[PDB]
């Protein structure tokens with residue numbers, strides 16, 4: 069006695085199947101999932117009739133569809149995505165001041181901070197899987213998008229996390245090709261040193277948080293040199309620096325990432341500049357005319373910059 | 379070959395003659411020795427006449443398992459044995475009459491559950507859980523903990539919630555004959571009374587004070603309303619609320635659950651009302667005439683209540 | 688279409704292999720690793736030609752080589768070592784005041800504290816795998832050594848840890864056989880009680896941190912406990928974390944512990960020309976130190992009491 073169901077790797081190309089009720093899913097399909105739940109070792113139930121089941125690439129049709137949708141060969145990917153998903157579908161994604169956040173759960177403050185930021189910067193993912201989920205995230209269905217993020221960064225639920233690290237991995241799969249930065253390092257001894265970055269390395273800097281400062285001058289070892297921004301072409305810039313007490317002034321930035329705690333007691337909050345300043349702490353929300361605290365990331369809007377130096 | 383026992387329940391022992399060359403796995407599939415996964419190792423000497431947990435791989439063991447555990451989930455044993463392998467190394471000291479746990483692997487929430495379960499009238503429907511619950515009260519609380527972790531799909535080290543844990547456990551408790559009746563009075567939308575049975579009858583999330591729950595509580599309807607208790611029939615009630623500063627007065631409650639810390643830095647302590655107030659913090663024990671602190675659960679003794687409203 | 692690679696369990700006995708490009712590694716070898724990375728499920732790539740791959744003991748040659756090198760029959764060992772390794776190779780091991788530390792990651796403060804201590808106390812591992820890695824640790828390549836420690840102690844990455852617990856498991860595999868301690872407990876009621884410990888139990892004590900005090904007298908259920916004879920290159924004095932003042936050059940190194948439950952942090956203090964506090968990649972100096980200490984290591988050759 070057999071029933072009718074669907075298998076897929078992308079949840080777009082559905083493949084029609086007739087499962088033997090006695091035999092388990094695993095026997096027939098190998099690794100098999102039902103909205104994250106690993107159903108490899110259980111046997112086809114009745115309620116399953118005409119439901120969609122994620123399976124592993126175990127033929128050429130599914131090996132293509134997978135790579136086409138996910139832009140990855142890693143045969144562990146689905147496993148960890150489905151694992152991640154099984155948890156993230158039980159997380160709460162409340163609307164907070166227009167934005168999909170996450171109620172705090174499983175040290176996920178860094179995923180929340182990522183998710184709030186991604187809704188406020190111009191960006192387009194190269195993988196369909198990521199672009200699709202990024203749309204349905206902004207809507208309010210951000211479970212999938214989170215699972216994919218955890219998957220793409222090889223993180224697991226409960227694992228501690230870094231916003232800046234996560235943004236980096238995600239910007240690999242963003243279309244940032246036409247983004248461009250030009251930096252110049254002036255020592256009176258060793259002369260000049262200019263660099264021309266494209267892609268991810270064009271938008272991210274680790275050293276200071278103030279973008280205005282980054283244009284004027286920044287002191288570094290070669291004794292000391294002067295680093296400044298020559299040309300920036302990108303829709304945003306991310307300015308990261310080791311967490312330090314810093315005053316955020318309204319409307320001088322897009323959003324920021326706060327980090328209290330030191331080791332495994334570390335917590336990210338998200339600050340966003342709107343009509344006034346809002347601090348998004350998962351499901352909780354504060355307002356002030358100005359903000360002071362340990363900031364580690366700051367995002368700034370940009371179109372085209374050129375410096376008035378030499 | 380040597381003589382050993384396989385079982386799924388550790389009650390029906392099945393006599394076996396294991397080939398010394400071949401590993402356990404080859405002969406039995408997944409095989410465990412007090413939690414330790416011995417699927418890949420070969421029968422040793424010291425094993426003679428020891429009891430080994432195996433997976434349901436025939437109809438005798440498929441029945442015994444479901445009869446004892448009240449679940450068909452073929453991952454259950456795996457996670458129970460995994461859990462067990464750790465919990466058998468935990469310390470379970472007696473603290474003011476009660477089996478606690480020395481702090482280990484973020485287990486403060488299991489400790490708090492365990493201390494509570496010893497102070498509220500309850501009967502588990504699964505034998506596995508009832509059996510272990512008896513041997514827990516005695517002092518052998520390793521198994522009971524493993525089963526709790528198992529039944530709640532938690533793993534060791536995983537952060538935990540007392541209230542969430544109690545809920546999952548009360549699913550397998552016999553609470554059928556428990557009954558609650560609640561009434562919500564708005565001057566706009568009139569009256570609204572509800573008749574809950576089972577788990578939903580004993581647990582409430584909103585406020586900690588049981589006395590206040592009988593008088594009145596304010597909630598949204600585009601207006602706010604008045605919620606009060608009409609009838610309660612159960613041996614205890616659990617009053618949960620988001621952790622908040624609250625004053626515990628001696629002998630106005632059975633036990634409580636305290637929660638300090640915010641994100642992954644959260645700690646549960648257990649407070650119990652006896653001749654005075656005792657705070658059980660794993661293996662540590664304090665006493666005061668009164669207590670003030672962030673409480674999130676309070677348990678109250680009850681037989682039968684009816685309101686004069 | 689096939690390429691040439693090497694399989695091994697010890698990375699000393701290399702076994703030459705010709706892998707089918709279509710089939711994955713797993714199909715051909717079972718569990719297969721490339722510097723920790725589990726490559727059981729991926730197929731032989733291009734870059735791999737003439738690289739060394741860790742495999743599981745799946746014949747008697749590799750079952751011997753493994754036990755010879757690791758001194759353990761636990762058939763899970765390599766799995767967890769390679770798993771551990773896959774993370775520890777991404778950790779930073781900076782030099783700090785002469786010593787290989789670790790930048791903080793995955794609650795690893797206790798591994799850092801162990802590692803800093805092991806560089807400052809005379810010790811020899813019985814497993815080759817551990818001695819080999821302990822040399823390459825002191826040099827600066829401490830990824831392997833850490834993986835092996837995590838492996839040998841049945842810990843995983845991110846798992847919370849105890850310095851004293853870790854030292855114990857490690858001293859099992861240290862050659863401490865000729866180490867010896869003699870303790871005497873004097874009650875005016877129940878008379879005298881002396882004990883003769885050898886091996887690991889000879890160097891470790893849980894009760895107080897002061898070695899000088901341990902020689903004079905210590906009160907227990909009361910009675911008086913004192914050290915009669917000590918023969919070992921170091922002693923470890925552990926006690927539940929408590930405020931304690933460290934005086935320069937009265938000890939080798941210590942272990943600090945702030946925090947209570949899962950918020951606990953180990954720092955390492957070392958006595959050199961002055962006092963240095965190693966907190967992973969961070970470094971402090973003071974003329975004196977006061978803080979919650981739980982372990983203190985002392986240099987010793989041969990002690991005998993005048994009591």
Ligand SMILES: [Cl-]
Pocket residue numbers: 177178180181336337338348349350
């Ligand atoms: Cl947040």
Ligand SMILES: [Cl-]
Pocket residue numbers: 486487489490646647648658659660
């Ligand atoms: Cl507790």
Ligand SMILES: [Cl-]
Pocket residue numbers: 788796799800953954955965966967
């Ligand atoms: Cl350290």
Ligand SMILES: [Zn+2]
Pocket residue numbers: 255256257258290291292293
């Ligand atoms: Zn210069």
Ligand SMILES: [Zn+2]
Pocket residue numbers: 564565566567568599600601602603
């Ligand atoms: Zn109303």
Ligand SMILES: [Zn+2]
Pocket residue numbers: 332333334642643644949950951
């Ligand atoms: Zn913490």
Ligand SMILES: [Zn+2]
Pocket residue numbers: 874875876877908909910
């Ligand atoms: Zn005595």
